[PDB]
Symmetry: C3
Subunit: 127 residues, 3 copies
């Protein structure tokens, strides 16, 4: 049984929702207004904590709009299934234009990616 458990850390938090029926990702909204300086970065809180199943992780993935319109990309974004701290989104601004994130703007989408995690076998030949 897959699951996506979400805890609001604030009254500011928006519960993530999927944008199309067969959408890969749950949209993540900013819990703050924040500058993202030209050629710099910002750490935007979501005011959520999450849990996802073992055998998956939550990837905070970029939105196509912020990227193509504002040259905004998402850094880091690997949220382990046992990570219970608050979810923040790191944004990089790859343009000479200051940008600003507004409270409640969708800044990323969370994608619950299937993975495997076997124990490493060291070999002298990989075959």
């Amino acid at each position: 049984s897959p699951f996506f458990k979400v805890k609001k850390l604030s009254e500011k938090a928006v519960i993530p929702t999927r944008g199309s029926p067969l959408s890969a990702g749950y949209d993540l909204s900013s819990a703050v207004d924040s500058k993202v300086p030209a050629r710099g970065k910002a750490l935007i809180p979501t005011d959520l904590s999450i849990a996802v199943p073992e055998g998956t992780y939550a990837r905070i993935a970029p939105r196509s709009g912020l990227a193509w319109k504002h040259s905004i990309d998402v850094g880091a974004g690997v949220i382990d299934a046992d990570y219970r701290g608050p979810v923040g989104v790191i944004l990089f601004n790859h343009s000479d234009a200051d940008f600003e994130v507004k409270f409640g703007d969708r800044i990323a989408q969370l994608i619950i990616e299937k993975i495997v995690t076997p124990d490493v076998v060291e070999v002298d030949d990989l075959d």
Copy 2:
């Protein structure tokens, strides 16, 4: 299901994406146009393809390794839903101080069909 990958050409410039080694993750994507990705800038490179991938996956537009080292090229955005039937364009960021030229038919990215889970969003206090 049975997984599948259907592509529809939107012009005769589109190239059928193909894999590159039998256990290969990704299907090479070719540019449909002559264009460029400016130094320290960005471009949308059309593929002239529309695609379908199975429910419980998405198509990730992912960077080629050769272009990353040689041109400082990275893919922006790149999340194509199993739902999406519009044209597929590749957002490229150029993290160097020289323009990156693209000719029609060059490989500018690779598409990976990643398995995902899509449950309902269950709010808690944990």
Copy 3:
């Protein structure tokens, strides 16, 4: 049955390890002293070769601390299940300060992502 095979290519390589039971990734360490120049890139050798199962790839993925503290991002990062050459991490530096890497520094994390690789078919009409 998933596996993760690793071959050391020198005594400078470190076997990737997972932080917690539910960690998505295996930490990767630099086999070299190097640097990522301000606004530039580097290829950092791992001195590893690897093999992962058919139906997966190894994604080279970013550490969040490095993203936030140093504006470090991972470029490239798609390692095919049948790629048997040396694993190098490409790093982009989205700040104006050079980033030093010391031999044994953790520079990325490896995630073994589940995928499908069906036979592509061109069609006249989409579903």
